[PDB]
Write a protein that binds this ligand. Structure first.
Ligand SMILES: O=C(c1cccc(O)c1)N1CCOCC1
Ligand SMILES: O=C(c1cccc(O)c1)N1CCOCC1
Lengths: 262, 265
Protein backbone atom coordinates (compact mmCIF):
# COMPACT_ATOMS: atom_id res chain seq x y z
CA UNK A 1 0.00 0.00 0.00
CA UNK A 2 1.05 3.62 -0.48
CA UNK A 3 0.19 7.29 -0.17
CA UNK A 4 -0.57 8.91 -3.59
CA UNK A 5 1.74 11.54 -5.23
CA UNK A 6 0.13 14.54 -3.43
CA UNK A 7 0.30 12.59 -0.09
CA UNK A 8 -3.40 13.44 0.63
CA UNK A 9 -4.96 9.95 0.03
CA UNK A 10 -3.84 6.30 0.36
CA UNK A 11 -4.22 3.33 -2.05
CA UNK A 12 -3.88 -0.41 -1.38
CA UNK A 13 -4.51 -3.61 -3.42
CA UNK A 14 -6.10 -6.77 -1.89
CA UNK A 15 -6.38 -10.33 -3.39
CA UNK A 16 -9.89 -11.68 -2.50
CA UNK A 17 -9.43 -14.72 -0.21
CA UNK A 18 -11.24 -18.14 -0.33
CA UNK A 19 -12.72 -17.77 3.19
CA UNK A 20 -13.75 -14.13 2.40
CA UNK A 21 -16.45 -15.05 -0.22
CA UNK A 22 -20.12 -16.08 0.01
CA UNK A 23 -22.35 -18.52 -2.00
CA UNK A 24 -21.84 -16.45 -5.22
CA UNK A 25 -17.97 -16.82 -4.84
CA UNK A 26 -17.71 -13.01 -4.41
CA UNK A 27 -16.58 -10.95 -1.38
CA UNK A 28 -19.11 -10.53 1.41
CA UNK A 29 -20.08 -6.96 2.46
CA UNK A 30 -18.38 -7.82 5.83
CA UNK A 31 -15.08 -8.72 4.02
CA UNK A 32 -15.40 -5.38 2.11
CA UNK A 33 -15.95 -3.42 5.39
CA UNK A 34 -12.89 -5.16 6.94
CA UNK A 35 -10.74 -4.03 3.96
CA UNK A 36 -12.11 -0.44 4.32
CA UNK A 37 -10.99 -0.57 7.99
CA UNK A 38 -7.58 -2.04 7.03
CA UNK A 39 -6.73 0.50 4.31
CA UNK A 40 -7.91 3.19 6.83
CA UNK A 41 -5.46 1.90 9.51
CA UNK A 42 -2.59 1.76 6.96
CA UNK A 43 -3.41 5.36 5.85
CA UNK A 44 -3.15 6.59 9.51
CA UNK A 45 0.11 4.61 9.99
CA UNK A 46 1.76 6.02 6.83
CA UNK A 47 1.21 9.63 7.93
CA UNK A 48 2.57 9.31 11.50
CA UNK A 49 -0.27 7.89 13.64
CA UNK A 50 -5.47 10.11 17.14
CA UNK A 51 -3.01 13.03 17.60
CA UNK A 52 -0.66 13.34 20.63
CA UNK A 53 -2.92 16.30 21.68
CA UNK A 54 -6.01 14.06 22.04
CA UNK A 55 -3.83 11.13 23.34
CA UNK A 56 -3.13 13.05 26.58
CA UNK A 57 -6.71 14.38 26.79
CA UNK A 58 -7.93 10.72 26.53
CA UNK A 59 -9.92 11.56 23.36
CA UNK A 60 -10.58 8.95 20.62
CA UNK A 61 -12.25 8.99 17.19
CA UNK A 62 -15.44 6.87 17.16
CA UNK A 63 -17.67 5.89 14.17
CA UNK A 64 -21.13 7.56 14.23
CA UNK A 65 -22.21 6.24 10.81
CA UNK A 66 -21.04 3.90 8.01
CA UNK A 67 -22.52 3.99 4.45
CA UNK A 68 -21.52 1.49 1.69
CA UNK A 69 -22.69 1.14 -1.95
CA UNK A 70 -21.47 -1.89 -3.98
CA UNK A 71 -22.02 -2.19 -7.78
CA UNK A 72 -19.89 -5.37 -8.20
CA UNK A 73 -18.54 -7.65 -5.46
CA UNK A 74 -14.95 -8.74 -6.26
CA UNK A 75 -14.70 -12.45 -7.09
CA UNK A 76 -12.44 -14.96 -5.24
CA UNK A 77 -8.88 -14.46 -6.61
CA UNK A 78 -9.65 -10.99 -8.05
CA UNK A 79 -7.58 -7.94 -7.02
CA UNK A 80 -9.46 -4.88 -5.69
CA UNK A 81 -7.86 -1.42 -5.28
CA UNK A 82 -9.14 0.87 -2.53
CA UNK A 83 -8.34 4.58 -2.25
CA UNK A 84 -9.15 6.36 1.04
CA UNK A 85 -9.02 9.95 2.29
CA UNK A 86 -10.09 11.91 5.39
CA UNK A 87 -11.60 15.44 5.56
CA UNK A 88 -12.61 17.80 8.41
CA UNK A 89 -16.33 18.74 8.75
CA UNK A 90 -15.86 21.68 11.14
CA UNK A 91 -16.39 21.12 14.87
CA UNK A 92 -18.92 18.29 14.16
CA UNK A 93 -16.16 15.80 13.29
CA UNK A 94 -14.24 14.08 10.52
CA UNK A 95 -15.23 12.07 7.44
CA UNK A 96 -13.36 9.18 5.88
CA UNK A 97 -14.33 8.19 2.28
CA UNK A 98 -13.31 5.22 0.11
CA UNK A 99 -13.43 4.22 -3.58
CA UNK A 100 -13.22 0.57 -4.59
CA UNK A 101 -11.97 -0.31 -8.07
CA UNK A 102 -11.35 -3.31 -10.32
CA UNK A 103 -7.54 -3.59 -10.59
CA UNK A 104 -7.70 -5.02 -14.15
CA UNK A 105 -10.18 -2.58 -15.77
CA UNK A 106 -9.91 0.50 -13.54
CA UNK A 107 -13.72 0.73 -13.20
CA UNK A 108 -15.35 1.81 -9.91
CA UNK A 109 -17.01 -1.21 -8.29
CA UNK A 110 -17.98 0.48 -5.00
CA UNK A 111 -17.88 3.53 -2.76
CA UNK A 112 -18.18 4.23 0.96
CA UNK A 113 -18.34 7.08 3.45
CA UNK A 114 -18.21 7.25 7.27
CA UNK A 115 -18.87 10.02 9.89
CA UNK A 116 -16.48 10.08 12.87
CA UNK A 117 -17.05 11.99 16.15
CA UNK A 118 -14.64 12.73 19.08
CA UNK A 119 -15.27 10.98 22.42
CA UNK A 120 -13.58 10.84 25.84
CA UNK A 121 -12.49 7.19 26.02
CA UNK A 122 -13.29 7.00 29.78
CA UNK A 123 -16.46 9.11 30.27
CA UNK A 124 -17.88 8.19 26.80
CA UNK A 125 -18.98 11.88 26.40
CA UNK A 126 -18.65 13.68 23.03
CA UNK A 127 -16.41 16.83 22.95
CA UNK A 128 -16.26 18.04 19.25
CA UNK A 129 -12.87 20.00 19.36
CA UNK A 130 -11.73 20.58 23.01
CA UNK A 131 -8.88 22.97 21.99
CA UNK A 132 -7.26 23.14 18.45
CA UNK A 133 -6.91 19.52 17.15
CA UNK A 134 -8.13 20.68 13.67
CA UNK A 135 -4.70 22.08 12.67
CA UNK A 136 -3.02 18.73 13.39
CA UNK A 137 -5.40 17.00 10.92
CA UNK A 138 -5.81 19.57 8.09
CA UNK A 139 -2.27 18.91 6.82
CA UNK A 140 -3.17 15.25 6.00
CA UNK A 141 -6.56 16.10 4.33
CA UNK A 142 -7.48 17.73 0.98
CA UNK A 143 -8.57 21.36 1.53
CA UNK A 144 -10.97 21.48 -1.47
CA UNK A 145 -14.14 19.29 -0.95
CA UNK A 146 -13.55 15.66 -2.16
CA UNK A 147 -16.70 13.55 -1.70
CA UNK A 148 -17.30 9.87 -2.54
CA UNK A 149 -21.06 10.78 -2.44
CA UNK A 150 -21.33 14.28 -3.96
CA UNK A 151 -25.06 14.09 -5.05
CA UNK A 152 -27.21 16.83 -3.35
CA UNK A 153 -29.17 15.14 -0.49
CA UNK A 154 -27.71 11.66 -1.27
CA UNK A 155 -28.40 8.30 0.57
CA UNK A 156 -25.38 8.67 2.91
CA UNK A 157 -26.95 11.69 4.68
CA UNK A 158 -30.53 10.33 5.06
CA UNK A 159 -32.25 10.27 8.47
CA UNK A 160 -33.02 6.68 9.67
CA UNK A 161 -36.14 6.15 11.85
CA UNK A 162 -36.70 3.75 14.78
CA UNK A 163 -38.24 0.34 13.88
CA UNK A 164 -41.58 -0.09 15.72
CA UNK A 165 -42.56 -3.45 17.28
CA UNK A 166 -43.70 -5.95 16.14
CA UNK A 167 -40.69 -6.51 13.83
CA UNK A 168 -41.44 -8.46 10.62
CA UNK A 169 -38.24 -10.58 11.02
CA UNK A 170 -35.84 -11.32 13.94
CA UNK A 171 -32.58 -13.02 14.97
CA UNK A 172 -32.40 -13.16 18.78
CA UNK A 173 -29.65 -13.95 21.34
CA UNK A 174 -26.64 -12.86 19.24
CA UNK A 175 -23.39 -12.54 21.17
CA UNK A 176 -19.75 -11.71 20.36
CA UNK A 177 -16.96 -14.29 20.51
CA UNK A 178 -13.16 -13.48 20.92
CA UNK A 179 -12.78 -13.39 17.08
CA UNK A 180 -15.28 -10.46 17.06
CA UNK A 181 -13.00 -8.33 19.29
CA UNK A 182 -10.28 -5.88 18.14
CA UNK A 183 -6.74 -5.46 19.69
CA UNK A 184 -8.36 -3.41 22.57
CA UNK A 185 -11.05 -6.03 23.52
CA UNK A 186 -13.83 -3.87 21.93
CA UNK A 187 -16.36 -5.38 19.46
CA UNK A 188 -15.26 -4.74 15.82
CA UNK A 189 -17.54 -2.28 13.89
CA UNK A 190 -17.97 -4.91 11.11
CA UNK A 191 -19.54 -7.40 13.60
CA UNK A 192 -22.54 -4.99 13.96
CA UNK A 193 -23.00 -5.10 10.13
CA UNK A 194 -23.10 -8.95 10.38
CA UNK A 195 -25.59 -8.83 13.25
CA UNK A 196 -27.87 -6.42 11.26
CA UNK A 197 -27.89 -8.79 8.28
CA UNK A 198 -28.65 -11.89 10.43
CA UNK A 199 -32.34 -10.95 10.52
CA UNK A 200 -32.57 -10.71 6.67
CA UNK A 201 -34.53 -13.77 5.43
CA UNK A 202 -32.37 -16.35 3.61
CA UNK A 203 -34.80 -16.18 0.63
CA UNK A 204 -33.66 -12.55 0.09
CA UNK A 205 -29.94 -13.31 0.50
CA UNK A 206 -30.20 -16.18 -2.01
CA UNK A 207 -32.16 -14.23 -4.72
CA UNK A 208 -30.86 -10.66 -4.23
CA UNK A 209 -27.55 -8.84 -3.94
CA UNK A 210 -26.92 -6.22 -1.28
CA UNK A 211 -26.46 -2.90 -3.02
CA UNK A 212 -26.68 -0.19 -0.29
CA UNK A 213 -26.16 -0.32 3.53
CA UNK A 214 -26.27 2.59 5.96
CA UNK A 215 -25.69 2.02 9.65
CA UNK A 216 -25.95 4.43 12.60
CA UNK A 217 -23.79 3.49 15.64
CA UNK A 218 -25.56 4.64 18.84
CA UNK A 219 -24.09 2.61 21.68
CA UNK A 220 -21.31 0.12 22.06
CA UNK A 221 -22.13 -3.54 22.58
CA UNK A 222 -19.91 -4.81 25.42
CA UNK A 223 -18.22 -8.27 25.50
CA UNK A 224 -20.93 -9.54 27.95
CA UNK A 225 -23.96 -7.98 26.20
CA UNK A 226 -26.53 -9.99 24.13
CA UNK A 227 -28.04 -8.51 20.97
CA UNK A 228 -31.34 -8.87 19.14
CA UNK A 229 -31.44 -8.11 15.37
CA UNK A 230 -34.78 -6.78 13.99
CA UNK A 231 -35.82 -6.13 10.34
CA UNK A 232 -38.99 -4.91 8.58
CA UNK A 233 -39.49 -4.60 4.78
CA UNK A 234 -40.21 -0.97 3.77
CA UNK A 235 -40.66 -1.42 -0.02
CA UNK A 236 -35.77 -3.76 -5.52
CA UNK A 237 -36.29 -4.73 -1.82
CA UNK A 238 -35.78 -2.17 1.05
CA UNK A 239 -35.42 -2.93 4.80
CA UNK A 240 -35.38 -1.08 8.14
CA UNK A 241 -33.06 -2.48 10.84
CA UNK A 242 -32.66 -2.23 14.62
CA UNK A 243 -30.04 -3.85 16.91
CA UNK A 244 -30.98 -3.64 20.62
CA UNK A 245 -29.89 -5.21 23.96
CA UNK A 246 -31.67 -8.57 24.50
CA UNK A 247 -32.76 -7.57 27.98
CA UNK A 248 -33.99 -4.00 28.34
CA UNK A 249 -34.22 -3.28 24.59
CA UNK A 250 -31.61 -0.47 24.77
CA UNK A 251 -30.76 0.60 21.17
CA UNK A 252 -27.21 -0.07 20.01
CA UNK A 253 -27.64 0.50 16.17
CA UNK A 254 -30.25 1.39 13.49
CA UNK A 255 -29.98 1.08 9.69
CA UNK A 256 -31.35 0.45 6.19
CA UNK A 257 -30.43 -1.95 3.36
CA UNK A 258 -31.26 -1.86 -0.40
CA UNK A 259 -31.23 -5.14 -2.32
CA UNK A 260 -31.26 -5.69 -6.15
CA UNK A 261 -32.83 -8.91 -7.66
CA UNK A 262 -30.11 -11.09 -9.30
CA UNK B 1 1.97 -17.18 -4.06
CA UNK B 2 3.78 -19.90 -6.02
CA UNK B 3 4.65 -23.57 -6.36
CA UNK B 4 8.34 -24.27 -5.44
CA UNK B 5 10.99 -25.31 -8.05
CA UNK B 6 10.20 -29.06 -7.82
CA UNK B 7 6.43 -28.26 -8.06
CA UNK B 8 5.73 -30.53 -5.01
CA UNK B 9 4.91 -27.80 -2.39
CA UNK B 10 3.44 -24.25 -2.42
CA UNK B 11 4.62 -21.02 -0.70
CA UNK B 12 2.74 -17.76 -0.04
CA UNK B 13 3.48 -14.53 1.90
CA UNK B 14 0.81 -12.71 4.01
CA UNK B 15 0.95 -9.19 5.62
CA UNK B 16 -0.69 -9.48 9.12
CA UNK B 17 -3.83 -7.29 9.12
CA UNK B 18 -5.09 -4.83 11.83
CA UNK B 19 -8.38 -6.71 12.39
CA UNK B 20 -6.47 -10.07 12.44
CA UNK B 21 -4.59 -9.41 15.77
CA UNK B 22 -5.51 -9.83 19.46
CA UNK B 23 -4.66 -7.85 22.66
CA UNK B 24 -0.90 -8.55 22.24
CA UNK B 25 -1.03 -6.99 18.66
CA UNK B 26 -0.10 -10.42 17.21
CA UNK B 27 -2.11 -12.77 14.93
CA UNK B 28 -4.81 -14.84 16.60
CA UNK B 29 -4.64 -18.66 16.24
CA UNK B 30 -7.92 -18.29 14.21
CA UNK B 31 -6.24 -15.82 11.77
CA UNK B 32 -3.32 -18.34 11.47
CA UNK B 33 -5.75 -21.24 10.74
CA UNK B 34 -7.52 -19.10 8.07
CA UNK B 35 -4.13 -18.50 6.34
CA UNK B 36 -3.34 -22.26 6.49
CA UNK B 37 -6.72 -22.85 4.73
CA UNK B 38 -6.02 -20.08 2.18
CA UNK B 39 -2.52 -21.24 1.19
CA UNK B 40 -4.04 -24.80 0.99
CA UNK B 41 -6.75 -23.60 -1.46
CA UNK B 42 -4.16 -21.72 -3.59
CA UNK B 43 -1.95 -24.88 -3.66
CA UNK B 44 -4.92 -26.96 -5.03
CA UNK B 45 -5.74 -24.22 -7.57
CA UNK B 46 -2.15 -23.93 -8.88
CA UNK B 47 -1.96 -27.67 -9.66
CA UNK B 48 -5.28 -27.93 -11.58
CA UNK B 49 -7.92 -28.61 -8.88
CA UNK B 50 -11.27 -26.80 -8.50
CA UNK B 51 -9.17 -30.15 -4.30
CA UNK B 52 -11.33 -33.02 -5.67
CA UNK B 53 -10.00 -35.31 -8.47
CA UNK B 54 -11.91 -36.22 -11.72
CA UNK B 55 -13.10 -39.48 -10.11
CA UNK B 56 -14.20 -37.76 -6.85
CA UNK B 57 -16.45 -35.25 -8.67
CA UNK B 58 -18.05 -38.15 -10.63
CA UNK B 59 -18.62 -40.23 -7.44
CA UNK B 60 -19.89 -37.30 -5.27
CA UNK B 61 -16.85 -37.84 -2.94
CA UNK B 62 -15.13 -34.96 -1.07
CA UNK B 63 -12.12 -34.55 1.22
CA UNK B 64 -13.13 -33.73 4.82
CA UNK B 65 -10.87 -32.74 7.80
CA UNK B 66 -10.65 -35.44 10.52
CA UNK B 67 -8.01 -33.62 12.61
CA UNK B 68 -6.14 -30.30 12.77
CA UNK B 69 -2.93 -29.86 14.86
CA UNK B 70 -1.13 -26.47 15.22
CA UNK B 71 1.99 -25.44 17.17
CA UNK B 72 2.99 -21.76 17.35
CA UNK B 73 6.38 -20.56 18.70
CA UNK B 74 5.86 -16.88 17.74
CA UNK B 75 2.64 -15.18 16.60
CA UNK B 76 3.36 -12.72 13.73
CA UNK B 77 2.88 -9.09 14.77
CA UNK B 78 0.49 -6.62 13.02
CA UNK B 79 2.28 -5.44 9.83
CA UNK B 80 4.76 -8.36 9.82
CA UNK B 81 5.05 -10.67 6.78
CA UNK B 82 4.70 -14.43 7.36
CA UNK B 83 5.66 -17.08 4.76
CA UNK B 84 3.75 -20.38 4.72
CA UNK B 85 4.85 -23.49 2.82
CA UNK B 86 2.32 -26.33 2.38
CA UNK B 87 2.42 -29.85 0.94
CA UNK B 88 0.14 -32.88 0.70
CA UNK B 89 1.01 -36.55 1.10
CA UNK B 90 -1.09 -39.73 0.80
CA UNK B 91 -1.27 -42.14 3.77
CA UNK B 92 -2.39 -45.25 1.86
CA UNK B 93 -6.11 -46.09 1.97
CA UNK B 94 -6.60 -44.14 5.26
CA UNK B 95 -6.54 -40.76 3.42
CA UNK B 96 -4.18 -37.81 2.88
CA UNK B 97 -2.27 -35.38 5.09
CA UNK B 98 -1.60 -31.73 4.48
CA UNK B 99 1.32 -30.13 6.41
CA UNK B 100 2.41 -26.49 6.78
CA UNK B 101 5.50 -24.55 7.95
CA UNK B 102 5.17 -20.89 9.01
CA UNK B 103 8.26 -18.69 8.82
CA UNK B 104 9.37 -15.15 9.61
CA UNK B 105 9.90 -13.49 6.20
CA UNK B 106 12.73 -11.23 7.50
CA UNK B 107 14.83 -13.77 9.44
CA UNK B 108 13.85 -17.09 7.83
CA UNK B 109 13.25 -18.71 11.23
CA UNK B 110 10.38 -21.20 11.74
CA UNK B 111 7.66 -19.57 13.85
CA UNK B 112 5.07 -22.38 13.58
CA UNK B 113 4.04 -25.69 12.11
CA UNK B 114 0.82 -27.54 11.45
CA UNK B 115 -0.52 -30.87 10.25
CA UNK B 116 -4.02 -32.11 9.30
CA UNK B 117 -5.56 -35.57 8.55
CA UNK B 118 -8.11 -35.67 5.70
CA UNK B 119 -10.56 -38.56 5.03
CA UNK B 120 -12.85 -39.25 2.00
CA UNK B 121 -16.62 -38.87 2.49
CA UNK B 122 -19.63 -39.18 0.18
CA UNK B 123 -21.08 -35.65 -0.05
CA UNK B 124 -24.73 -36.87 0.03
CA UNK B 125 -24.74 -39.92 2.41
CA UNK B 126 -22.02 -38.50 4.76
CA UNK B 127 -20.47 -42.06 4.76
CA UNK B 128 -16.71 -42.44 5.00
CA UNK B 129 -14.73 -44.78 2.72
CA UNK B 130 -11.09 -45.74 2.09
CA UNK B 131 -9.19 -44.18 -0.86
CA UNK B 132 -9.43 -46.21 -4.12
CA UNK B 133 -6.31 -46.83 -6.27
CA UNK B 134 -7.57 -44.84 -9.30
CA UNK B 135 -8.09 -41.70 -7.12
CA UNK B 136 -4.76 -42.30 -5.31
CA UNK B 137 -2.69 -42.23 -8.57
CA UNK B 138 -4.38 -38.96 -9.72
CA UNK B 139 -2.95 -36.98 -6.79
CA UNK B 140 0.31 -38.98 -6.14
CA UNK B 141 1.89 -36.85 -8.94
CA UNK B 142 1.34 -33.64 -6.86
CA UNK B 143 2.92 -35.14 -3.66
CA UNK B 144 6.52 -35.85 -2.54
CA UNK B 145 7.12 -39.62 -2.69
CA UNK B 146 9.76 -39.68 0.10
CA UNK B 147 8.23 -38.96 3.61
CA UNK B 148 8.15 -35.17 4.38
CA UNK B 149 6.71 -34.52 7.86
CA UNK B 150 6.14 -31.20 9.67
CA UNK B 151 6.01 -33.33 12.90
CA UNK B 152 8.63 -36.07 12.44
CA UNK B 153 9.14 -36.84 16.23
CA UNK B 154 8.63 -40.41 17.63
CA UNK B 155 6.10 -39.63 20.36
CA UNK B 156 4.74 -36.49 18.65
CA UNK B 157 1.62 -34.59 19.88
CA UNK B 158 -0.05 -34.52 16.41
CA UNK B 159 -0.99 -38.23 16.58
CA UNK B 160 -2.04 -38.49 20.27
CA UNK B 161 -5.42 -40.00 21.22
CA UNK B 162 -7.85 -37.44 22.79
CA UNK B 163 -10.35 -38.71 25.41
CA UNK B 164 -13.97 -37.62 26.07
CA UNK B 165 -14.47 -34.83 28.69
CA UNK B 166 -16.64 -36.15 31.58
CA UNK B 167 -19.36 -33.96 33.17
CA UNK B 168 -19.27 -31.78 35.20
CA UNK B 169 -17.03 -29.57 33.02
CA UNK B 170 -14.77 -27.14 34.95
CA UNK B 171 -15.57 -24.26 32.50
CA UNK B 172 -18.33 -23.65 29.89
CA UNK B 173 -19.55 -21.31 27.14
CA UNK B 174 -23.15 -22.25 26.24
CA UNK B 175 -25.57 -21.33 23.38
CA UNK B 176 -22.94 -20.63 20.69
CA UNK B 177 -24.32 -20.36 17.16
CA UNK B 178 -22.94 -19.60 13.68
CA UNK B 179 -23.72 -16.39 11.79
CA UNK B 180 -23.43 -15.90 7.92
CA UNK B 181 -19.79 -14.73 8.34
CA UNK B 182 -19.02 -18.21 9.80
CA UNK B 183 -20.14 -19.97 6.59
CA UNK B 184 -17.95 -20.89 3.57
CA UNK B 185 -18.94 -20.49 -0.17
CA UNK B 186 -21.07 -23.72 0.14
CA UNK B 187 -23.12 -22.58 3.24
CA UNK B 188 -21.15 -25.00 5.51
CA UNK B 189 -19.60 -23.80 8.82
CA UNK B 190 -15.89 -22.92 8.36
CA UNK B 191 -13.44 -25.33 10.14
CA UNK B 192 -11.80 -22.31 11.89
CA UNK B 193 -15.13 -21.38 13.58
CA UNK B 194 -14.92 -24.67 15.60
CA UNK B 195 -11.42 -23.60 16.83
CA UNK B 196 -12.99 -20.27 18.02
CA UNK B 197 -15.85 -22.10 19.74
CA UNK B 198 -13.38 -24.45 21.55
CA UNK B 199 -11.42 -21.46 22.87
CA UNK B 200 -14.56 -19.61 24.06
CA UNK B 201 -14.68 -21.75 27.21
CA UNK B 202 -11.02 -20.90 28.12
CA UNK B 203 -11.11 -18.48 31.10
CA UNK B 204 -10.11 -14.90 30.22
CA UNK B 205 -7.50 -15.01 33.04
CA UNK B 206 -5.63 -17.71 31.03
CA UNK B 207 -5.92 -15.87 27.69
CA UNK B 208 -4.59 -12.66 29.29
CA UNK B 209 -1.57 -14.28 31.10
CA UNK B 210 -0.68 -17.16 28.74
CA UNK B 211 0.00 -17.72 25.06
CA UNK B 212 -1.54 -20.62 23.16
CA UNK B 213 1.28 -22.90 22.09
CA UNK B 214 -0.35 -26.19 20.94
CA UNK B 215 -3.92 -27.02 19.72
CA UNK B 216 -5.17 -30.36 18.47
CA UNK B 217 -8.76 -30.74 17.35
CA UNK B 218 -10.68 -33.84 16.27
CA UNK B 219 -13.66 -33.15 13.91
CA UNK B 220 -16.40 -35.73 14.57
CA UNK B 221 -19.63 -34.24 13.23
CA UNK B 222 -20.59 -31.18 11.29
CA UNK B 223 -22.41 -28.36 13.04
CA UNK B 224 -25.30 -27.29 10.78
CA UNK B 225 -26.41 -23.65 10.20
CA UNK B 226 -29.41 -24.21 12.61
CA UNK B 227 -27.51 -26.12 15.33
CA UNK B 228 -26.51 -24.59 18.74
CA UNK B 229 -23.19 -25.51 20.36
CA UNK B 230 -21.91 -25.80 23.92
CA UNK B 231 -18.13 -25.40 24.55
CA UNK B 232 -16.71 -27.34 27.55
CA UNK B 233 -13.18 -27.20 29.08
CA UNK B 234 -11.41 -28.87 32.04
CA UNK B 235 -7.81 -28.17 33.18
CA UNK B 236 -5.68 -31.36 32.99
CA UNK B 237 -2.35 -29.99 34.33
CA UNK B 238 4.90 -22.98 34.06
CA UNK B 239 2.44 -24.60 31.56
CA UNK B 240 -1.39 -25.02 31.57
CA UNK B 241 -3.13 -27.97 29.75
CA UNK B 242 -6.86 -28.27 28.88
CA UNK B 243 -9.34 -30.90 27.63
CA UNK B 244 -12.12 -29.64 25.32
CA UNK B 245 -15.52 -30.84 24.10
CA UNK B 246 -17.97 -29.16 21.66
CA UNK B 247 -21.45 -30.76 21.72
CA UNK B 248 -25.00 -29.96 20.49
CA UNK B 249 -26.84 -27.76 23.04
CA UNK B 250 -29.86 -30.05 23.01
CA UNK B 251 -29.08 -33.75 23.02
CA UNK B 252 -25.35 -33.37 23.83
CA UNK B 253 -24.27 -35.03 20.52
CA UNK B 254 -20.47 -34.63 20.15
CA UNK B 255 -19.29 -32.45 17.27
CA UNK B 256 -15.55 -31.99 18.30
CA UNK B 257 -12.99 -32.90 21.01
CA UNK B 258 -9.52 -31.41 21.62
CA UNK B 259 -6.61 -30.29 23.80
CA UNK B 260 -4.72 -26.99 24.22
CA UNK B 261 -1.26 -26.26 25.74
CA UNK B 262 -0.59 -22.76 27.07
CA UNK B 263 2.73 -21.26 28.25
CA UNK B 264 2.95 -18.36 30.77
CA UNK B 265 3.97 -15.00 29.19
O1 LIG C 1 -21.55 5.91 22.07
C1 LIG C 1 -21.26 5.70 20.89
C2 LIG C 1 -20.30 4.59 20.57
C3 LIG C 1 -19.10 4.51 21.28
C4 LIG C 1 -18.23 3.47 21.04
C5 LIG C 1 -18.57 2.46 20.16
C6 LIG C 1 -19.82 2.45 19.57
O2 LIG C 1 -20.15 1.47 18.68
C7 LIG C 1 -20.68 3.53 19.77
N1 LIG C 1 -21.73 6.49 19.90
C8 LIG C 1 -22.86 7.41 20.13
C9 LIG C 1 -22.85 8.54 19.13
O3 LIG C 1 -21.54 8.77 18.63
C10 LIG C 1 -21.08 7.66 17.85
C11 LIG C 1 -21.39 6.32 18.49
O1 LIG D 1 -18.34 -36.21 10.29
C1 LIG D 1 -17.34 -35.68 9.82
C2 LIG D 1 -17.40 -34.24 9.39
C3 LIG D 1 -17.82 -33.91 8.11
C4 LIG D 1 -17.88 -32.59 7.72
C5 LIG D 1 -17.53 -31.58 8.59
C6 LIG D 1 -17.17 -31.89 9.89
O2 LIG D 1 -16.83 -30.89 10.75
C7 LIG D 1 -17.09 -33.22 10.29
N1 LIG D 1 -16.23 -36.41 9.57
C8 LIG D 1 -16.25 -37.88 9.60
C9 LIG D 1 -15.16 -38.36 10.53
O3 LIG D 1 -13.88 -37.89 10.11
C10 LIG D 1 -13.85 -36.46 10.08
C11 LIG D 1 -14.91 -35.88 9.18
Amino acid sequence: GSLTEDGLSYKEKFVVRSYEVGSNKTATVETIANLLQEVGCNHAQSVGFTTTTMRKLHLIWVTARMHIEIYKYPAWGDVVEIETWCQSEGRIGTRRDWILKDSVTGEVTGRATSKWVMMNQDTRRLQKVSDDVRDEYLVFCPQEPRLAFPEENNRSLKKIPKLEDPAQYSMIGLKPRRADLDMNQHVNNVTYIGWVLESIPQEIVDTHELQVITLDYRRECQQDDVVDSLTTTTSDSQFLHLLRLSGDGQEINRGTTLWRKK
